[PDB]
Design a protein around this ligand. Sequence first.
Ligand SMILES: [Cl-]
Lengths: 172, 25
Amino acid sequence: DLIPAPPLSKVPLQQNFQDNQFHGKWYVVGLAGNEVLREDKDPMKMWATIYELEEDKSYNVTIVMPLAEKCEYLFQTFVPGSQPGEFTLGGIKSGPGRTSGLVRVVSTNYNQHAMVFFKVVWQNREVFWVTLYGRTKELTSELKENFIRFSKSLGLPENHIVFPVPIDQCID
Amino acid sequence: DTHFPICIFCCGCCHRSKCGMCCKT
Ligand SMILES: [Cl-]
């Protein structure tokens, strides 16, 4: 059953966001979403997101995912949005029949962790997820518990909160 | 004329509990 996207007031932006310190590779240490469940029959494997900062302050983004038979590489463009640390996908704005996305860097210290909020307008509904990013594949219990509390504050129950399994293939 | 599919990266959307490209149909 449907969990609505939270109001943007509940999704803070990191203060004094430094786009040139947020660049580089991040591992998805945690993932929570309104359409993501923990799947014990096929537990999510760790994946990675690489942020390349461009001269115009967009990010060219590479997503690296481990599939059974290959490494998958997907590509996005995060274009500067309405606030520092907010981006839209491919520069496409919110519109009443239209596929679009939003990105918000909620919290980060740049050299260890981040939490990032993502939302898309998909088939006339809002789909959202939060990544707990690490510069390494492991983070402290404390940071994971903070991610759990933030995820819950957005209305996500516990079985919508996932910790992808650390692996070496594809993401190194 | 050329067909230009509208696709985005999503965790969810066309596939619950999976992250990948979803294209609007
Ligand atoms: Cl495609």
